Design a protein around this motif. Structure first.
Motif, PDB file in Angstrom:
ATOM      1  N   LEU A 287      32.704  92.667 110.204  1.00 26.57           N
ATOM      2  CA  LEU A 287      32.074  93.653 109.340  1.00 26.57           C
ATOM      3  C   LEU A 287      33.050  94.732 108.926  1.00 26.57           C
ATOM      4  CD1 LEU A 287      28.565  94.233 111.043  1.00 26.57           C
ATOM      5  CD2 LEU A 287      29.162  92.633 109.219  1.00 26.57           C
TER       6      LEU A 287
ATOM      7  N   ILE B 223      13.645 103.582 105.932  1.00 28.98           N
ATOM      8  CA  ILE B 223      14.712 103.546 106.931  1.00 28.98           C
ATOM      9  C   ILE B 223      15.814 102.572 106.560  1.00 28.98           C
ATOM     10  CG2 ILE B 223      15.262 103.067 109.333  1.00 28.98           C
ATOM     11  CD1 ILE B 223      12.661 104.174 110.139  1.00 28.98           C
TER      12      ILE B 223
ATOM     13  N   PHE C  37      15.814  81.974 105.817  1.00 29.85           N
ATOM     14  CA  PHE C  37      15.934  82.828 104.643  1.00 29.85           C
ATOM     15  C   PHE C  37      16.783  84.067 104.951  1.00 29.85           C
ATOM     16  CE2 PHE C  37      14.390  84.868 100.700  1.00 29.85           C
ATOM     17  CZ  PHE C  37      14.746  86.192 100.959  1.00 29.85           C
ATOM     18  N   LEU C  38      17.865  84.242 104.191  1.00 28.35           N
ATOM     19  CA  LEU C  38      18.601  85.506 104.121  1.00 28.35           C
ATOM     20  C   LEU C  38      18.859  85.787 102.638  1.00 28.35           C
ATOM     21  CD1 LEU C  38      21.177  85.101 107.045  1.00 28.35           C
ATOM     22  CD2 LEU C  38      18.921  86.186 107.127  1.00 28.35           C
ATOM     23  N   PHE C  39      19.006  87.062 102.307  1.00 30.35           N
ATOM     24  CA  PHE C  39      19.094  87.514 100.929  1.00 30.35           C
ATOM     25  C   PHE C  39      20.317  86.996 100.175  1.00 30.35           C
ATOM     26  CE2 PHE C  39      18.255  90.258  97.371  1.00 30.35           C
ATOM     27  CZ  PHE C  39      19.513  90.659  96.927  1.00 30.35           C
TER      28      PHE C  39
ATOM     29  N   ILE D  60      15.751  94.886 103.424  1.00 29.13           N
ATOM     30  CA  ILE D  60      15.146  95.559 102.297  1.00 29.13           C
ATOM     31  C   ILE D  60      14.215  94.555 101.546  1.00 29.13           C
ATOM     32  CG2 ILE D  60      15.647  96.650 100.086  1.00 29.13           C
ATOM     33  CD1 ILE D  60      18.248  97.774 101.455  1.00 29.13           C
ATOM     34  N   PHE D  61      14.706  93.346 101.292  1.00 28.02           N
ATOM     35  CA  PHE D  61      13.891  92.327 100.628  1.00 28.02           C
ATOM     36  C   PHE D  61      12.648  91.972 101.440  1.00 28.02           C
ATOM     37  CE2 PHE D  61      13.369  88.947  97.524  1.00 28.02           C
ATOM     38  CZ  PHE D  61      12.496  88.094  98.192  1.00 28.02           C
ATOM     39  N   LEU D  62      12.837  91.623 102.700  1.00 29.12           N
ATOM     40  CA  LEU D  62      11.706  91.296 103.562  1.00 29.12           C
ATOM     41  C   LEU D  62      10.752  92.471 103.702  1.00 29.12           C
ATOM     42  CD1 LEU D  62      13.328  89.307 106.519  1.00 29.12           C
ATOM     43  CD2 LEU D  62      12.094  88.410 104.508  1.00 29.12           C
TER      44      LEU D  62
ATOM     45  N   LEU E 216      19.663 103.265 105.891  1.00 30.96           N
ATOM     46  CA  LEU E 216      20.754 102.585 106.573  1.00 30.96           C
ATOM     47  C   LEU E 216      21.716 101.912 105.608  1.00 30.96           C
ATOM     48  CD1 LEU E 216      18.776 101.106 109.594  1.00 30.96           C
ATOM     49  CD2 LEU E 216      20.490 102.999 109.676  1.00 30.96           C
TER      50      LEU E 216
ATOM     51  N   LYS F  53      15.758  91.687 113.283  1.00 30.43           N
ATOM     52  CA  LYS F  53      16.941  90.866 113.447  1.00 30.43           C
ATOM     53  C   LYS F  53      17.987  91.130 112.377  1.00 30.43           C
ATOM     54  CE  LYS F  53      16.399  86.822 115.323  1.00 30.43           C
ATOM     55  NZ  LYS F  53      16.071  85.368 115.435  1.00 30.43           N
ATOM     56  N   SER F  54      17.540  91.371 111.147  1.00 30.92           N
ATOM     57  CA  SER F  54      18.465  91.661 110.055  1.00 30.92           C
ATOM     58  C   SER F  54      19.138  93.027 110.201  1.00 30.92           C
ATOM     59  CB  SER F  54      17.737  91.599 108.700  1.00 30.92           C
ATOM     60  OG  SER F  54      17.057  90.373 108.538  1.00 30.92           O
TER      61      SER F  54
ATOM     62  N   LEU G 262       7.304  88.581 109.627  1.00 29.93           N
ATOM     63  CA  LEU G 262       8.344  89.251 108.850  1.00 29.93           C
ATOM     64  C   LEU G 262       9.014  90.386 109.655  1.00 29.93           C
ATOM     65  CD1 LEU G 262       6.962  89.364 105.105  1.00 29.93           C
ATOM     66  CD2 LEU G 262       8.936  88.102 106.033  1.00 29.93           C
TER      67      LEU G 262
ATOM     68  N   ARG H   6      19.700  94.612 113.191  1.00 29.89           N
ATOM     69  CA  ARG H   6      20.638  94.312 114.262  1.00 29.89           C
ATOM     70  C   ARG H   6      21.886  93.591 113.768  1.00 29.89           C
ATOM     71  NH1 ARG H   6      20.498  89.675 118.446  1.00 29.89           N
ATOM     72  NH2 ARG H   6      18.353  89.196 117.789  1.00 29.89           N
ATOM     73  N   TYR H   7      21.781  92.815 112.693  1.00 31.14           N
ATOM     74  CA  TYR H   7      22.969  92.136 112.154  1.00 31.14           C
ATOM     75  C   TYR H   7      23.589  92.896 110.989  1.00 31.14           C
ATOM     76  CZ  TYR H   7      22.550  88.061 115.199  1.00 31.14           C
ATOM     77  OH  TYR H   7      22.509  87.232 116.294  1.00 31.14           O
ATOM     78  N   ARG H   8      23.005  94.036 110.658  1.00 32.28           N
ATOM     79  CA  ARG H   8      23.537  94.883 109.601  1.00 32.28           C
ATOM     80  C   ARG H   8      23.446  94.136 108.289  1.00 32.28           C
ATOM     81  NH1 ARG H   8      22.243  98.789 112.591  1.00 32.28           N
ATOM     82  NH2 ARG H   8      22.778  98.162 114.735  1.00 32.28           N
ATOM     83  N   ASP H   9      22.535  93.171 108.256  1.00 30.77           N
ATOM     84  CA  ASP H   9      22.193  92.472 107.022  1.00 30.77           C
ATOM     85  C   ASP H   9      21.026  93.209 106.345  1.00 30.77           C
ATOM     86  OD1 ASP H   9      21.553  90.816 104.921  1.00 30.77           O
ATOM     87  OD2 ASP H   9      20.853  89.149 106.172  1.00 30.77           O
ATOM     88  N   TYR H  10      21.361  94.286 105.644  1.00 33.00           N
ATOM     89  CA  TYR H  10      20.367  95.240 105.176  1.00 33.00           C
ATOM     90  C   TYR H  10      19.654  94.737 103.920  1.00 33.00           C
ATOM     91  CZ  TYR H  10      22.289  98.671 108.572  1.00 33.00           C
ATOM     92  OH  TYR H  10      22.649  99.300 109.738  1.00 33.00           O
ATOM     93  N   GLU H  11      20.383  94.073 103.023  1.00 35.99           N
ATOM     94  CA  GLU H  11      19.767  93.450 101.831  1.00 35.99           C
ATOM     95  C   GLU H  11      18.582  92.553 102.207  1.00 35.99           C
ATOM     96  OE1 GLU H  11      20.267  94.682  99.254  1.00 35.99           O
ATOM     97  OE2 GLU H  11      22.277  95.542  99.260  1.00 35.99           O
ATOM     98  N   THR H  12      18.766  91.711 103.203  1.00 29.90           N
ATOM     99  CA  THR H  12      17.655  90.897 103.672  1.00 29.90           C
ATOM    100  C   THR H  12      16.504  91.760 104.170  1.00 29.90           C
ATOM    101  OG1 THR H  12      19.102  89.076 104.252  1.00 29.90           O
ATOM    102  CG2 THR H  12      16.955  89.147 105.306  1.00 29.90           C
TER     103      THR H  12
ATOM    104  N   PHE I 196      23.330  84.170 110.055  1.00 27.40           N
ATOM    105  CA  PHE I 196      24.056  85.414 109.776  1.00 27.40           C
ATOM    106  C   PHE I 196      25.560  85.240 109.607  1.00 27.40           C
ATOM    107  CE2 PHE I 196      20.023  86.826 111.496  1.00 27.40           C
ATOM    108  CZ  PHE I 196      19.672  87.793 110.571  1.00 27.40           C
TER     109      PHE I 196
ATOM    110  N   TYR J 258      12.998  91.980  92.043  1.00 24.42           N
ATOM    111  CA  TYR J 258      13.968  90.891  92.170  1.00 24.42           C
ATOM    112  C   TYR J 258      13.677  89.763  91.182  1.00 24.42           C
ATOM    113  CZ  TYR J 258      15.038  93.280  96.525  1.00 24.42           C
ATOM    114  OH  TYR J 258      15.383  94.234  97.470  1.00 24.42           O
TER     115      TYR J 258
ATOM    116  N   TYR K 173      31.955  89.762 115.646  1.00 21.43           N
ATOM    117  CA  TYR K 173      31.053  90.020 114.541  1.00 21.43           C
ATOM    118  C   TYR K 173      31.289  91.395 113.893  1.00 21.43           C
ATOM    119  CZ  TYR K 173      26.906  90.080 111.657  1.00 21.43           C
ATOM    120  OH  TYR K 173      26.039  90.232 110.630  1.00 21.43           O
TER     121      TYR K 173
END
Ligand SMILES: [Cl-]
Lengths: 231, 225
Positions: free
Chosen positions: B64, A38, B139-141, A19-21, A42, A8-9, A2, A11-17, B109, B192, B60
């Motif tokens: 954003l 953190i 898996f992504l949210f 936070i979930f993970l 962010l 990785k999330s 995890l 770094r991709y600014r995919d923060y929801e993922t 992504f 969730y 990318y």
């Protein structure tokens, strides 16, 4: 696994993922509630991050605590949080995955605490004490807020007359303040946008404070055109 | 330059003004400037620097910034450049900087973001297609939550993958054992699950259970909802 996915999330600014993970990870490895805090910070979620941070007490936790408090303009708490570190009343962060460790705060980097402390004192109405933190911060290392505030107050500490392009920027600024040197202005005029945007901006301000409105507007106008979004 | 280590240090401290300034001194490492500007909430300024570039990482961050500014057509166009392979490889840079860069092999992504953009932009079906294609890799949210919401999650015939399994099952079974299982992890993954539960219940007209579930999370995790 995890962890790598969370990094990785981020770094991709995919923060929801992230936070979930992170939420999934709380049980398995609790030495990671910092990480949750953190990623929440962010993602712009300061009140939520504080909930997790209260459950902790390390240099990194108290630091993010101060940041969250500052976003919420609770300066007294922001300040209290930082002092905990500088006063040495926090524990060492847990040994964690190396990718996580990198996101942690070293208590030896006091420039950052004194700087933030300077901002907090200032925002909180204690300018003189703030200047003192800026001074103490600048003594260790160049940071933007102590430098810009000390220049602004002409209270930057000088030798009797250490290195870097930024330290040269400070030297030039101190000199221009007291000399209004046109050679200096012309030198930094070529780097707009860039370092020049700051120098010329500060120049324009000094000019105004001296009543020289003509040069003041010239300087501002320059930046307004070569870097409209800077100002 | 020694300026790199200092910029990383400033990012790690969330001292972005310093990082922006030190970045300005350093000006190809223009990507780094764009990033720190993005982190500091300055999307229009970051775009100015980004226009001067054309890599997977630049396009990318471009997407954003465009998404923050709700320019969805441009956000979409920027991403497609990558997926369509019309961008250059980022420069060989300091290792600390490289880590902040985007690998074109991490398409989950891009498809996820593409899913959001199609959706926000009024193309829900196409968006679901990106979510589906994204979820197929990883898996992504956002793909997961939208696919569950639409009951359009792809099934056959990780703790997160178990969360998805339970969610698929609970959607069609309303399993009270599932609810009770996730009730113990609030705040947490349960927040969730139970929150989704509450939503399903409403859609079924079962307002009683719907409020029970919502109320639970409102109390054990008021700031989640
Ligand atoms: Cl980061």
């Amino acid at each position: 696994k995890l962890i790598g996915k969370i990094c990785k999330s981020i770094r991709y600014r995919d923060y929801e993922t992230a936070i979930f993970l992170a939420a999934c990870l709380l049980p398995c490895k609790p030495e990671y509630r910092m990480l949750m805090s953190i990623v929440l910070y962010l993602n712009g979620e300061y009140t939520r991050a504080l909930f997790h941070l209260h459950k902790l007490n390390t240099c990194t936790s108290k630091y993010y605590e101060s940041l969250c408090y500052k976003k919420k303009k609770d300066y007294k708490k922001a300040i209290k949080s930082l002092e905990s570190i500088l006063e040495g009343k926090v524990e060492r962060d847990p040994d964690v995955d190396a990718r996580i460790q990198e996101m942690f705060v070293d208590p030896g980097d006091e420039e950052f605490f004194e700087s933030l402390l300077g901002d907090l004192c200032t925002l909180s109405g204690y300018r003189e004490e703030g200047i003192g933190h800026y001074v103490r911060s600048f003594g260790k290392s160049f940071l933007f807020s102590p430098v810009e505030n000390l220049l602004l107050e002409n209270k930057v500490p000088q030798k009797r007359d250490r290195r870097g392009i930024e330290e040269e920027y400070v030297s030039d600024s101190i000199e221009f303040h007291e000399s209004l040197s046109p050679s200096l202005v012309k030198k930094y005029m070529e780097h707009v946008p860039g370092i020049g945007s700051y120098f010329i901006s500060n120049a324009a301000r000094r000019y105004f404070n001296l009543g020289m409105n003509d040069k003041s507007k010239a300087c501002f106008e320059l930046v307004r055109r070569k870097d409209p979004m800077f100002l």
